[PDB]
Amino acid sequence: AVPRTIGAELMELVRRNTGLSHELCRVAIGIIVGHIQASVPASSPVMEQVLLSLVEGKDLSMALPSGQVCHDQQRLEVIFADLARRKDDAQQRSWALYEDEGVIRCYLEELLHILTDADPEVCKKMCKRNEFESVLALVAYYQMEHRASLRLLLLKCFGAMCSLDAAIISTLVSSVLPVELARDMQTDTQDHQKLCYSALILAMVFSMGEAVPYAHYEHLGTPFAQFLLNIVEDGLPLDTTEQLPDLCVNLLLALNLHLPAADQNVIMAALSKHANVKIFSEKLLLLLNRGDDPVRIFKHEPQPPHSVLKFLQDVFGSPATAAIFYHTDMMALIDITVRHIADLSPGDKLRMEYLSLMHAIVRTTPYLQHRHRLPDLQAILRRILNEEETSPQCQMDRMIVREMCKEFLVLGEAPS
Amino acid sequence: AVPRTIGAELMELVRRNTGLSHELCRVAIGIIVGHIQASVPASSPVMEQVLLSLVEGKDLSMALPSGQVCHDQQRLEVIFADLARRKDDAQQRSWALYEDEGVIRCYLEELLHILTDADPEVCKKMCKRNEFESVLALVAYYQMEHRASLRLLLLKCFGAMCSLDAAIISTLVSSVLPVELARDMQTDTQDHQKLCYSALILAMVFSMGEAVPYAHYEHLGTPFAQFLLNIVEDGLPLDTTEQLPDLCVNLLLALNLHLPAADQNVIMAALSKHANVKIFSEKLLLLLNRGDDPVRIFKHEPQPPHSVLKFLQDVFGSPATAAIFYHTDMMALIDITVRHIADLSPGDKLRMEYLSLMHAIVRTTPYLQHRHRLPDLQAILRRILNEEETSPQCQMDRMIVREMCKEFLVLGEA
Amino acid sequence: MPAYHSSLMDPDTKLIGNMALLPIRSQFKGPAPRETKDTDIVDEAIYYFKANVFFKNYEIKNEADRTLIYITLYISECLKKLQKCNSKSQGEKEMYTLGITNFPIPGEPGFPLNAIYAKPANKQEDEVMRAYLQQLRQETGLRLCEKVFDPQNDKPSKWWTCFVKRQFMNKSLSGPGQ
């Protein structure tokens, strides 16, 4: 019989020289052993090829070699070591003497491949080790590095890390990286590529909705929110892809995701004070109409609220921001939500959110003086209130209708 | 026992779903079965023969189990079919209506990968299919296309194709492609990226020294040579990498390689007429000092002459072009020759060429006026004519010394 | 529709395979008799060539069309060599060495029109039509070499070499098997 670790040996021994992506490396071995298991029937009855297949079929996840650490670990060892030194070579970071851009860039190029073509467990473990030592090393180095040619690869490396585990996201949220990125964007509007990645990474970083150091809002407060509204409302001459408006809409949704209320909200105070929010008003409805959440760019499981439903509930929480919308836009909003509340089946998490957003719209807009879809709303609220389903979320849906109709007796009245 | 095609069954199957480059695919097969048979030698009655079946170069290489067509062949057929079907769409190629850049870009960049990731012998077999129709149609499309983006990918394809086979090169040289590249460069100096690739592909095709249609000289001759000399002397404001100076040196060396005779040579007229060439002069000697030949970029079998030696022998073939060197460069040229001629072991074919270059220099420069390194030259010529080996190249060296010595008896020590 | 077809099918003129052994006004050695009229089948082909290559359908009237078409296919091949030639002297020497090469004959593989020419069955057919087709080639190349080179400079003239790309109904006497 074959040594019962053979498949974990092959999984690394093939990557050592093919350079394959780890996920394809599993397939590349599986297919050849799978074929020879058929094309020579003499090879399957002996455990060899069945065992070669089964050893790849790890118990749930497994890739432990019989001995020394895999080639991917050894590269992360050397790369994170060398950057960790260059971070603190105080005589070279300032008062530079040797040429080092070439060597550093090669290290970052390689790192970015390992984070994207190696085993996620090995990368995840290596970033976690020593309580995220090497994550903070890159962040501190990114703060003091000023050559934009190098900064751009650090952004990409941080992106690949964000995909890797929510715990790394939380570290980058808590670190200086976001508040440095905001300062960069507000200062150096002349690198369209760096601007796009800066916006994307902030959206990636905040995508898990955790609270930040209060020190962050010196920059991430209203002046940055006003900056983002301007980028969406008329953009930049360099944005020949017209790509920043989308990234900045995505960013405001992620920035707001962690704030607790509408009154203190540093984003909503920007919308209130901005001169005219024509384009942002429109783009927000095109997203709500489809009803997807752009901020859930990753698969991490303890997911936050649906970002756009959240952002709209935070808009309508005060009369000053309820005036954001043009009349025709708010008519289309009531139509879109009155549709989504009807079509969602019982027990869906999201049906409560549209119910809450109607409650917000009813309570703070001039709704009962124009009544745009009030017959159709009542006909649905009739059904929702009578709904005989008994799950906890269904009970909560029925309760918020009881709150809504008790506040506004025009709701729940008999049909005309 | 093993089904005796298994090695070709496996090699295709892995490429199909991995996308590996073909050499890496072979490596993947070799290591996987190798490592199991190292772990359990009792697998040898199957694993040895599975390995042994893989050992094919072109002999039964990619043998069909039965009637299969490997994925790379399928895609090459589809691409060359569709590119032709677009090239002849005479309505769309002059009175455009449909949007077509995207689909063409995808087909071209897919082609470029297959020409470099797949088995070269398949790629050859599809290019040379019906008297190079696949190649010549794609060339005719390049003359007709004018989107700069699409032009740039076509050049990359032509290079990969040019790498495959001298039969493809000689087709490209004989077709229209060189003329359009030279016309493009003289007129559209602004696309630095296309300009660099244009000079590269143009030097690649000429690298075999094939004779061109005389109609080509109309564009390729003296006007174009002056244009290249201006770039290598003066540069262009848009070149921040200085690649054009080096590429234009290589391109002049490539075009000269095929020209016969000496006096009427269209490049030599340009060197004669150009106003004080000098950067080209000292760049050229730095090639001779190392002795490499930038034009031999491909391993194709019938190796043409050493391009730099050929070029200098042309330059000194006449007194009007011999004058281009500065006096300090002339001395170093003599120093470099006298060293190589002395260093080269007997029977090296190059030693004939250095002998001939020295012969040309003495006949057309005022050498006997300045006599630099003359004692060393006498001693080495005295040696070579007294060297005692018998192979034809040693005889050829010995003969050139005799004819050079009798023309200039001072070189014999009188 | 009507491309140019051979004029000189005299009933006296013998056939081999499906080709008519028309007399030739040539100093080259070969089995067909010596022509004495001003026009000749090689000159029909050379006179028609510029017009004939543009037509895309060609209906065989007789064996002489299967003969004259062969010349035009060979002219569309000799133009490939002489466009590269620096001088008329080079071309004339080159062309002599071109025509003596062993081009395929009817039904021998790679010959482009196996559907339309039948192979000679016997030595006295085969050897004689080789000896005929050879002298046709030899003469045909030389007659181009007299008129494609402009006499002012021996430039192989633009007006003739323009046709090199325009193969006769996409048929190559080089043959598609190579």
Chains that touch C (3 or more CB pairs under 8 A): B
Question: Is B214 within 8 Å of C86 when comparing Cβ atoms?
Answer: yes
C176 vs B contacts (CB less than 8 Å): 130-131
Question: Per residue, what are the HEC states of chain A?
Answer: CCCCCHHHHHHHHHHHHHCCCHHHHHHHHHHHHHHHHHHCHHHCCCHHHHHHHHHHCCCCCCCCCCCCCCHHHHHHHHHHHHHHHHHHCHHHHCCCCCCCHHHHHHHHHHHHHHHHHCCHHHHHHHHHHHHHHHHHHHHHHHHHCCCHHHHHHHHHHHHHHHCCCHHHHHHHHHCCHHHHHHHHHHHCCCCHHHHHHHHHHHHHHHCCCCCCCHHHHHHHCHHHHHHHHHHHHHCCCCCCCCCHHHHHHHHHHHHHCCCCCCCCCCCHHHHHHCCCCHHHHHHHHHHHHHCCCCCCCCCCCCCCCCHHHHHHHHHHCCHHHHCCCCHHHHHHHHHHHHHHHHHCCCCCHHHHHHHHHHHHHHHHCCHHHCCCCHHHHHHHHHHHHHCCCCCHHHHHHHHHHHHHHHHCCCCCCCCC
Q: What residues have CB less than 8 Å from C72, skipping those under 6 apart?
A: C45, C48, C49, C52, C53, C168
Residue type, B331: M
Name the residue among B6, B24, B35 with its Cβ closest to that of A39. Answer: B6
Question: Is A36 within 8 Å of B50 when comparing Cβ atoms?
Answer: yes
Alpha-carbon gap, residue B189 to B236, rounded angstroms = 8
Q: What residues have CB less than 8 Å from B317, skipping those under 6 apart?
A: B262, B263, B268, B360, B364
Alpha-carbon gap, residue A186 to A304, rounded angstroms = 28
Residue of B9, B14, B24, B68 for testing the chain A interface, max A β-carbons within 10 Å: B14
Q: Is A95 exposed, middle or buried (0-12, 13-18, 19+ CB in 10 A)?
A: exposed
Alpha-carbon gap, residue B300 to B163, rounded angstroms = 9
B214 at interface of C, judged by CB pairs closer than 8 A: yes
Other Cβ atoms within 10 Å of A401 Cβ, number: 21
Alpha-carbon gap, residue B178 to C68, rounded angstroms = 35
CA distance to A126, A302, B83, per residue, from B142 (Å): 51, 55, 11
Alpha-carbon gap, residue A358 to A341, rounded angstroms = 9
Other Cβ atoms within 10 Å of B169 Cβ, number: 21
Q: Bridge-partner residues for C20, per DSSP?
A: C15
Alpha-carbon gap, residue B387 to B389, rounded angstroms = 6
Chains A and B touch (3+ CB pairs under 8 A): yes
Portion 253-282 of A in contact with B at CB < 8 A: none
Report CA torsion sign: C87, C92, C94, C98.
positive
A11 at interface of B, judged by CB pairs closer than 8 A: no
B216 at interface of C, judged by CB pairs closer than 8 A: no
Nearest to B140 by CA among B208, B187, B98, B86: B86
Looking at the complex, report in whole angstroms how far the Cα of residue C96 sits from the nearest Cα belonging to chain B: 19
- The domain segmentation of chain C, as residue ranges, is 2-175
Residue B224's H or E segment, with its range, is: helix B222-234
Alpha-carbon gap, residue A340 to A290, rounded angstroms = 10
Judge: domain C2-175, CATH 1.10.1760.10. yes
Alpha-carbon gap, residue B156 to B198, rounded angstroms = 10
Nearest to B163 by CA among B113, B132, B201, B107: B201
Alpha-carbon gap, residue A296 to A302, rounded angstroms = 11
A48 at interface of B, judged by CB pairs closer than 8 A: yes
Q: What residues have CB less than 8 Å from B19, skipping those under 6 apart?
A: A24, B117
CB-based contact B394:B348 (threshold 8 Å): no
B5 vs A contacts (CB less than 8 Å): none
Question: Is A2 within 8 Å of B50 when comparing Cβ atoms?
Answer: no
Looking at the complex, report in whole angstroms how far the Cα of residue A104 sits from the nearest Cα belonging to chain B: 21
Name the residue among B20, B39, B43 with its Cβ closest to that of A18. Answer: B20
Nearest to A75 by CA among A126, A26, A14, A120: A126
Helix (H, G, I), strand (E, B) or coil at B402: helix
Chains C and A touch (3+ CB pairs under 8 A): no
CB-based contact C145:C91 (threshold 8 Å): yes
Alpha-carbon gap, residue A28 to A389, rounded angstroms = 50
Nearest to B60 by CA among B120, B3, B8, B117: B8
Q: Is A143 exposed, middle or buried (0-12, 13-18, 19+ CB in 10 A)?
A: middle
Q: Bridge-partner residues for C19, per DSSP?
A: C16
Nearest to B146 by CA among B104, B115, B106: B104
Name the residue among B130, B131, B213 with its Cβ closest to that of C83. Answer: B213
B392 at interface of C, judged by CB pairs closer than 8 A: no
A181 at interface of B, judged by CB pairs closer than 8 A: no
Helix (H, G, I), strand (E, B) or coil at B176: coil
Other Cβ atoms within 10 Å of B48 Cβ, number: 14
Name the residue among A3, A28, A39 with its Cβ closest to that of B14. Answer: A28
Name the method of structure determination.
Answer: cryo-EM
- How far is CA B270 from its chain centroid? 23
Alpha-carbon gap, residue B153 to A260, rounded angstroms = 53
